[PDB]
Amino acid sequence: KQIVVAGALISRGTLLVAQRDRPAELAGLWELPGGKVTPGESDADALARELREELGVDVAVGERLGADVALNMTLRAYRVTLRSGSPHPHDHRALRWVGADEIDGLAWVPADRAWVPDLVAALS
């Protein structure tokens, strides 16, 4: 199982979500950003690397958020917190900061939908 990590970045009381740009089936839909773990990397090292490339930030990787999602690979989310930088959509169509009440109305990528109740809880 190839592991894919995702980050739930909470800052000043809101969650960062990222709007995919590709492929066509996901372009326009929202996700927790991240990517594949390369063999030899820890989950923390992979997620920090992905978020530095995608968002231009240095984050600290914390506790898991929610459960694994079986894509077929397996997707796991972690809480992350900002160390330096301000996020910009280098690899996404857009970013947004959302509160608890916005989470269930967002047009999530299908895999991430499972985390809705966990994200609401984390913001509540």
Residue 82 φ then ψ, to 5°: -70, 135
Per DSSP (E only), the strands in 71-123 are: 74-84, 94-98
Residue 69 bridge partners (DSSP):
75
Q: What is 1-124's CATH topology?
A: Nucleoside Triphosphate Pyrophosphohydrolase (3.90.79)
Angstrom distance (rounded) from CA 3 to CA 16 = 21
Tally the residues of the chain: 124
Angstrom distance (rounded) from CA 42 to CA 64 = 14
Angstrom distance (rounded) from CA 71 to CA 50 = 19
Angstrom distance (rounded) from CA 115 to CA 113 = 5
Angstrom distance (rounded) from CA 28 to CA 55 = 17
Angstrom distance (rounded) from CA 100 to CA 117 = 10
Instruction: Judge whether 7 and 33 are in contact, CB under 8 Å.
Output: yes
Angstrom distance (rounded) from CA 39 to CA 116 = 29
Where are the domains positioned within the chain?
Answer: 1-124
Q: How was this structure determined?
A: X-ray
Report resolution (Å) to 1 decimal: 1.1
